[PDB]
Amino acid sequence: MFSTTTLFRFVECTEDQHALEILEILNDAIINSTALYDYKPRSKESMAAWFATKRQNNFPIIGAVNEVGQLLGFASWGSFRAFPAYKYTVEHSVYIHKDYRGLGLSKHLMNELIKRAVESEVHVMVGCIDATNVASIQLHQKLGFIHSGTIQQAGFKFGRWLDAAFYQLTLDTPLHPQDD
Amino acid sequence: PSTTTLFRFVECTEDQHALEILEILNDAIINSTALYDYKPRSKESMAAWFATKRQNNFPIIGAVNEVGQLLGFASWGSFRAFPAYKYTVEHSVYIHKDYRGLGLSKHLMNELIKRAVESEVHVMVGCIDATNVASIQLHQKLGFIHSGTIQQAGFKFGRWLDAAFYQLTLDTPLHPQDD
Amino acid sequence: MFSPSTTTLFRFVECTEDQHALEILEILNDAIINSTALYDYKPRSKESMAAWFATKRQNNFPIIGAVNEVGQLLGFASWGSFRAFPAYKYTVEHSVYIHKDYRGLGLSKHLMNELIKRAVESEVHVMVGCIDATNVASIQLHQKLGFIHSGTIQQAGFKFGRWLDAAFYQLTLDTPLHPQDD
Amino acid sequence: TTTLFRFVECTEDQHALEILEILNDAIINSTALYDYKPRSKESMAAWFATKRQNNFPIIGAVNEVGQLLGFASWGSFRAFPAYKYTVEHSVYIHKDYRGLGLSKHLMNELIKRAVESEVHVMVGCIDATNVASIQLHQKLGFIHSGTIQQAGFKFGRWLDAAFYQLTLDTPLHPQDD
Amino acid sequence: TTTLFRFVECTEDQHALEILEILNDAIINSTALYDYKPRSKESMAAWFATKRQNNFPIIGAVNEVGQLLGFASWGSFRAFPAYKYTVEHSVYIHKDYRGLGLSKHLMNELIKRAVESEVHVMVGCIDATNVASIQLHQKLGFIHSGTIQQAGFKFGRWLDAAFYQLTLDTPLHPQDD
Amino acid sequence: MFSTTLFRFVECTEDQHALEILEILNDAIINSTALYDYKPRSKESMAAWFATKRQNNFPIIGAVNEVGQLLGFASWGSFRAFPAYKYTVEHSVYIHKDYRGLGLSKHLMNELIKRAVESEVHVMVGCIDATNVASIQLHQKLGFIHSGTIQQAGFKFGRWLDAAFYQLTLDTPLHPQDD
Ligand code: NA
Numbered sequence A: 001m002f003s004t005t006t007l008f009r010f011v012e013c014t015e016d017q018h019a020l021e022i023l024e025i026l027n028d029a030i031i032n033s034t035a036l037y038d039y040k041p042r043s044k045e046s047m048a049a050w051f052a053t054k055r056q057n058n059f060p061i062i063g064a065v066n067e068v069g070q071l072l073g074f075a076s077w078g079s080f081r082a083f084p085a086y087k088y089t090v091e092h093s094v095y096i097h098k099d100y101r102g103l104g105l106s107k108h109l110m111n112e113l114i115k116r117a118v119e120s121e122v123h124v125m126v127g128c129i130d131a132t133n134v135a136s137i138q139l140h141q142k143l144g145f146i147h148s149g150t151i152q153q154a155g156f157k158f159g160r161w162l163d164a165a166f167y168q169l170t171l172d173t174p175l176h177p178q179d180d
Numbered sequence B: 001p002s003t004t005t006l007f008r009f010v011e012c013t014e015d016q017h018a019l020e021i022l023e024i025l026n027d028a029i030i031n032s033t034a035l036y037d038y039k040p041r042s043k044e045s046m047a048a049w050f051a052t053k054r055q056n057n058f059p060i061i062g063a064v065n066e067v068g069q070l071l072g073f074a075s076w077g078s079f080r081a082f083p084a085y086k087y088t089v090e091h092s093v094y095i096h097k098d099y100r101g102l103g104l105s106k107h108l109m110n111e112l113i114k115r116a117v118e119s120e121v122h123v124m125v126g127c128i129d130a131t132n133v134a135s136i137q138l139h140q141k142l143g144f145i146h147s148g149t150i151q152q153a154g155f156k157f158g159r160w161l162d163a164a165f166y167q168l169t170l171d172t173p174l175h176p177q178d179d
Numbered sequence C: 001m002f003s004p005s006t007t008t009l010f011r012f013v014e015c016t017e018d019q020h021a022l023e024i025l026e027i028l029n030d031a032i033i034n035s036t037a038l039y040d041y042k043p044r045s046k047e048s049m050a051a052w053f054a055t056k057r058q059n060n061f062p063i064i065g066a067v068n069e070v071g072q073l074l075g076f077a078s079w080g081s082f083r084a085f086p087a088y089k090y091t092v093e094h095s096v097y098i099h100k101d102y103r104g105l106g107l108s109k110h111l112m113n114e115l116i117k118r119a120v121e122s123e124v125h126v127m128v129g130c131i132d133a134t135n136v137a138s139i140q141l142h143q144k145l146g147f148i149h150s151g152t153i154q155q156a157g158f159k160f161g162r163w164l165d166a167a168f169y170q171l172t173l174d175t176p177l178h179p180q181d182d
Numbered sequence D, E: 001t002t003t004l005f006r007f008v009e010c011t012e013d014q015h016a017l018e019i020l021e022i023l024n025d026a027i028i029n030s031t032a033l034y035d036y037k038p039r040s041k042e043s044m045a046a047w048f049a050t051k052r053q054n055n056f057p058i059i060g061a062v063n064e065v066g067q068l069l070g071f072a073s074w075g076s077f078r079a080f081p082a083y084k085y086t087v088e089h090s091v092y093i094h095k096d097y098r099g100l101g102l103s104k105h106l107m108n109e110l111i112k113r114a115v116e117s118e119v120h121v122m123v124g125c126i127d128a129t130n131v132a133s134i135q136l137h138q139k140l141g142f143i144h145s146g147t148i149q150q151a152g153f154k155f156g157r158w159l160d161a162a163f164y165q166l167t168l169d170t171p172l173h174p175q176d177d
Numbered sequence F: 001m002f003s004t005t006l007f008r009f010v011e012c013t014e015d016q017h018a019l020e021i022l023e024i025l026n027d028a029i030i031n032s033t034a035l036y037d038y039k040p041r042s043k044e045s046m047a048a049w050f051a052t053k054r055q056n057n058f059p060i061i062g063a064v065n066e067v068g069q070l071l072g073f074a075s076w077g078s079f080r081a082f083p084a085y086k087y088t089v090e091h092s093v094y095i096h097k098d099y100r101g102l103g104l105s106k107h108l109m110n111e112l113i114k115r116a117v118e119s120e121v122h123v124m125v126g127c128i129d130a131t132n133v134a135s136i137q138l139h140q141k142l143g144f145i146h147s148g149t150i151q152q153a154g155f156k157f158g159r160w161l162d163a164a165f166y167q168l169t170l171d172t173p174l175h176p177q178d179d
């Protein structure tokens, strides 16, 4: 032969179904990581706006759930820079539940988001990563992201300066890009 | 040269400069990649622009001639909208089309950098079209470092644009603190 | 539009002894040697220029300079006592010198405009300029700024082997609002 | 009654006192001096010193007793080398002796001294409202060069400083320094 | 050539107006008095009354005709019983009779009155820059006790109040009160 | 630690301290060359003394112990009574007989000098028996300079006394003027 077995299935996350689990995941990230550039845990109210922005913008929120429907992680994107000519560029994020790490869920979610990007005629995906976060950088390089550069000491967290490394993936889409 | 042109620094205000500023931005938008807008700004749109700067104490430093004509201005705003980026600003300088090539950009940047030191900013970031030799050379002269470039991040005038990020790290703040 | 070939860009600065003594010294001596604009015969020393700075500091006399994009002193304007007696407290005598390479560009007028603004803030009542009566360009400049011819002391000066007429031009300000004896 | 006048060459030791009293009266009572406050016995020392260092003359008129009825003097008009042939003069007559024509006699003496001292222009500075001194100067050959209006402020009012000038035939051979 | 004078004992009835004129002149024109504003006949009544009721002398110098040329007096230096043998003196000379040696004559006579009156110390308080008065006091044997720098303010400036003292052989038998 | 005399400053008033002050003063009159009176002062006279202080707004700073007893006071008055002495005061400080050599004079002097600065005083003058080395040293530590000494100006206990004058010149007033 060759404990337990866990299912992961991709779903479109909805405010009704996952607001609470998503808030929980984001807050762990806020508290114990240089991932999110928040200090204070987000509120229930804040989460409501988060969903509304993704809805208005048709930003995907792709979740991975187990057999019980418990959210194991999600991946999403939003605007990278809020100016009109950045229309074909998004910034992605992926967050895994503190109980389901080191199983490769980040990679599987990222691949599903990359497929969705191609489908949505995205040209560039940008990831902003703490420059010391070796594991995340490595995951992004495995997916074909390339180091675009690093803004030194752009962030301040846990009482110290942090470097924001940017990693980008350029897709064959859109075939026919146009000005607004 | 037969002429003199005076410049002196003033704080730009809405009631005083909204129109001159609007005309400068619209020119930048229609004619160049200095703004990643496609379509000109409305006078209405310029009300929130000013309001946002007032309520964040973002400075707007202008250069005016002997007559008080706005020759150009420089400002900054949020670089990335998350609390931990609170010491990083994104700045821009725009020079009126009749006064380009005189070194105003540099003088306005030097004043904006002094204000940045005074406002406890840690990093100023300029986002430039990576083919804009003049702007790049301005930032290099000023001591900026090329942090990186997002290739084909923008699209305007029917082509892919590379967004370059140039940064200047200051000695301030002496006492950063989480919020 | 404009260009570095069609226009000199310049800004105002407050002249200091540390930053501007040498340039100021060179501008003065040029005027001393080549014109009737200063009533000296021999060039001024560096030492003499140090006292000059001292007088203006002690008295809160402004020294307003014009500087090109590159940092070169294009010229300066200043004032001092007109006559050395207490009841002349509200009267100053001003002067403006333009660097030899930058004459004819309207620098004098800019500096004068800025100096006059400073006078209004300093509660000056009268600014007096003392000009060689043959100096058409300087007179015209003073007239365009609203100075009026107060009179002329004929053959008051002697330079380059000839008698010079000293014309006086004055500008009367609305300040001070509350003039008082000492 | 009678009264003798006789020209002398004033000095600190002999006249500082009588000169101080005349000046102080002029200061408190008129616009002939643009001082607000009386002068010292101290302040007077420098006044004489400057005269001596530059050989500026001080011509007094004294009577039988030997008392100073008045005096006339000159000094620098403008402190730059190119004004070396221009002096500024003043004449002060004691208050009891005014209206006798003393200033006229003192001035005429000072003019003669100026011719002898290679002076080219004597400038008198005068309150533009002082009809009498204006007329005296006109009688003596001075012309109204000009007036700086409201150049002074004293007794709560603006003063007009008038400049009257007398151009001499001397020096025959002026020369730059 | 000399000007004859004689000493009189001044009184309010006889000399008030002449003394007021001399003081007011000193007040307006100099620092010999630390008053700003002139005095009046009414101001004087109390001045004379204070000297009468304390038997402070007022010594006058009077010309051949009987006109007051100057006067000297003393009063309390500091108002505490322990200072009973110390007086502060002053001498004022009419403005037309200065430089004749009068303040010296008057001081000498005052000094003699002080001996006769059992005074032990005479103090003169003078502007530390009044050279002539400093010299008069030195000639008389006064020594410079010291100076209160910037003790006064007049004519828009700080004044130094110098204290000159002369110590006498009297009183032979001083006694606490 | 401590088991010491502990005290506070009060603004003395005729009502509260007339009695204690008159007693402090009489002790000094009788036993020292510090006050230049021969005889004890009357209670009637004290009322007049206070009146003057009130009339002129001359300070009377007091030092009181826990119980509430007056341990000493400092004050000032006219130095010489002529208008042009308007910016000069003569100060005095007396310490109760049982509390001397404890530093009260220094504390009271510091407090008085503060008051002089708030009051636009230019010169404080102290008149001291020239043999009073202790007081002179105290005044010197506070920045007083010896202005001079009038020999045998005083008479007390059957002997001639030298009166020393010490002055402290202040930066105030900023804009002095003739009356
Ligand atoms: Na951009």
Ligand code: NA
Pocket: C083, C085, D033, D034, D125, D161
């Ligand atoms: Na004058």
